[PDB]
Amino acid sequence: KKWWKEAVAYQIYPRSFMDSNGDGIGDIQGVISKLDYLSDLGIDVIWICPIYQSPNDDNGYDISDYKDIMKDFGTMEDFDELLDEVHHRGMKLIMDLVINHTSDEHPWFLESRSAKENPYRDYYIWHEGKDGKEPNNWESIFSGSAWEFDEKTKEYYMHVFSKKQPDLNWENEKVRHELYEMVNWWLDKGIDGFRVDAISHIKKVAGFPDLPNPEKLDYVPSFEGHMNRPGIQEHLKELKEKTFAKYDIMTVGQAGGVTSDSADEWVAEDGGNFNMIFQFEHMGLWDKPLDLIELKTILTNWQNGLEKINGWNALYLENHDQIRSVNKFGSTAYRVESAKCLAALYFLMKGTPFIYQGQELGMTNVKFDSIDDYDDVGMINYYRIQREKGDSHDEIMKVIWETGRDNSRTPMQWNTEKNAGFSTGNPWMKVNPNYVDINVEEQKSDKNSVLNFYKQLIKIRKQHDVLVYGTYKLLAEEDSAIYAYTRTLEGKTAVVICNMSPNNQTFEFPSFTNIEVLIHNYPLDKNETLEQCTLHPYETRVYLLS
Numbered sequence: 001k002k003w004w005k006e007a008v009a010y011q012i013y014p015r016s017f018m019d020s021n022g023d024g025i026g027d028i029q030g031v032i033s034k035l036d037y038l039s040d041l042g043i044d045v046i047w048i049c050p051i052y053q054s055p056n057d058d059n060g061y062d063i064s065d066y067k068d069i070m071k072d073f074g075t076m077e078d079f080d081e082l083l084d085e086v087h088h089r090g091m092k093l094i095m096d097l098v099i100n101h102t103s104d105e106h107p108w109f110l111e112s113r114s115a116k117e118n119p120y121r122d123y124y125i126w127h128e129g130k131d132g133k134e135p136n137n138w139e140s141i142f143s144g145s146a147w148e149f150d151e152k153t154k155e156y157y158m159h160v161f162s163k164k165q166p167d168l169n170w171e172n173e174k175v176r177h178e179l180y181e182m183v184n185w186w187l188d189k190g191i192d193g194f195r196v197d198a199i200s201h202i203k204k205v206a207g208f209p210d211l212p213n214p215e216k217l218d219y220v221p222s223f224e225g226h227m228n229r230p231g232i233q234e235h236l237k238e239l240k241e242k243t244f245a246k247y248d249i250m251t252v253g254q255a256g257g258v259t260s261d262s263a264d265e266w267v268a269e270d271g272g273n274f275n276m277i278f279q280f281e282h283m284g285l286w287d288k289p290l291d292l293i294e295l296k297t298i299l300t301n302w303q304n305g306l307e308k309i310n311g312w313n314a315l316y317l318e319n320h321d322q323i324r325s326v327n328k329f330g331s332t333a334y335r336v337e338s339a340k341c342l343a344a345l346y347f348l349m350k351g352t353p354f355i356y357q358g359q360e361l362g363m364t365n366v367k368f369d370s371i372d373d374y375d376d377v378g379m380i381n382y383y384r385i386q387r388e389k390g391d392s393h394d395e396i397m398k399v400i401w402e403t404g405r406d407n408s409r410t411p412m413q414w415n416t417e418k419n420a421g422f423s424t425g426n427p428w429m430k431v432n433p434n435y436v437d438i439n440v441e442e443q444k445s446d447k448n449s450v451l452n453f454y455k456q457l458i459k460i461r462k463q464h465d466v467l468v469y470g471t472y473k474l475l476a477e478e479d480s481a482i483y484a485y486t487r488t489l490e491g492k493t494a495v496v497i498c499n500m501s502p503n504n505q506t507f508e509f510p511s512f513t514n515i516e517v518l519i520h521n522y523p524l525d526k527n528e529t530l531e532q533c534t535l536h537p538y539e540t541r542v543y544l545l546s
């Protein structure tokens, strides 16, 4: 019923995808050079992370010119070539729309900060201090205060994210008008839509009241002051009417603070802000084995919850903000098996699946010895803030190694040449040493590779409508090792069975005129009875019943 429901999306982090000119930084001509790879994978939609002019304090999410390409990545002519090549391959491109905040080097902010009476002052969020300190006790998501003092005008500006990412004032009609014009300027070029960044953060609680601080911390996590706050829907409804609704595009909103039963306004077919949202509930399961049943509960709540409102799920396990999914949800002791198990698990639920670069190879976390090898502004600021407070170097590195999103930002691993073929120079972030084992070139020619498993997943989803539009139903809910579910559409039922445990397990097949195995990550045992499945660690199978 919709092209974006049937699509499989691939997410490119361009700084780490392909360097075409030896400076160690991925670029647009690098992306163009690998479009055959994404075509051959079977990708329908490419989401490219921000490629706009940026000082790169937050690697593109701090934008200083919305209408110019980041110099590191190329020019508008390179972008025009990329879009032309993508569209001639029958693929689509969505851009990363970043309008909660700008760079502090954006011309609007350079005007805004210059004087209280500057006409751009109210484009951002300014407030006098309180009792000689910040206007309130809110913490930035990147640690430290959510307020930065301006010596010249003697006021603080708010930044939910880095000090170089001042938040835009969405209560200002002039701001909204300029943002809508710029969105439509991009849409007029014929891009196919947007992933909408941090979009849950655009409504701040008026008066910015202090939050509880019983532990007398320096600052306190401030989501209750700015994540999905009452009043946000007025802005998002206007954004949709003034921009997205005028074009045949897809939108996926990155929307924290939305629950599976309160998602109508965000994604309902009748009146939702977006076609689909990224929600974070399944990415917050920290400890000793993974709580499989809590994962079932979360994902099933979203399957059932959006089915009731005619919404649509964005399916994912990886992106540029998370650690690698083999680490987070699988096992490094069963890297290939668990990568495939996880793939079948998340990809075949009802929704639009996203593949993050390297996920299709089973890429895993890195451990660099030195803080100087890392880049993430959030984790570097965390280091500095916590080191100042007396946290030891080793305690801080443990947090960065186990939770830091730099784990997903190491160069894409193309082959076993220098830098895994990502660059002829010195990569901006070092390649994971396991590229000698994990790389596209080796996986292409190995029928058993993670890459070719993803290829077959994409193919079976395209060829069987039940895997796109079939109703989801959780099976065997209480089983602490097996995640199993069905997809049903008329006379076809797909059964997805995943042994999400590092042990052998036995599972009773749910009890058709015909049965077919669509995909499997272990050799099939001829003597095995369908009724009593003897599953190996992280074994997955997908059956098709008529």
Ligand SMILES: OC[C@H]1O[C@H](O[C@H]2[C@H](O)[C@@H](O)[C@@H](O[C@H]3[C@H](O)[C@@H](O)[C@@H](O)O[C@@H]3CO)O[C@@H]2CO)[C@H](O)[C@@H](O)[C@@H]1O
Pocket (backbone or CB within 6 Å): 058, 061, 062, 098, 141, 161, 197, 198, 199, 200, 227, 254, 256, 257, 280, 283, 284, 320, 321, 378
């Ligand atoms: O452009 C700044 C930043 O924005 C994007 O990521 C941010 C999310 O928008 C924001 O909601 C927050 O995510 C947190 C979730 O709300 C919370 O449920 C849980 O998942 O912890 C997260 C805290 O970090 O913060 C992220 C960034 O950390 C964008 O995708 C980022 O790349 C970008 O840096």
Ligand SMILES: [Ca+2]
Pocket (backbone or CB within 6 Å): 018, 019, 020, 021, 022, 023, 024, 025, 026, 027, 072
């Ligand atoms: Ca380059």
Ligand SMILES: [Ca+2]
Pocket (backbone or CB within 6 Å): 525, 528, 533, 534, 535, 536
């Ligand atoms: Ca067996």
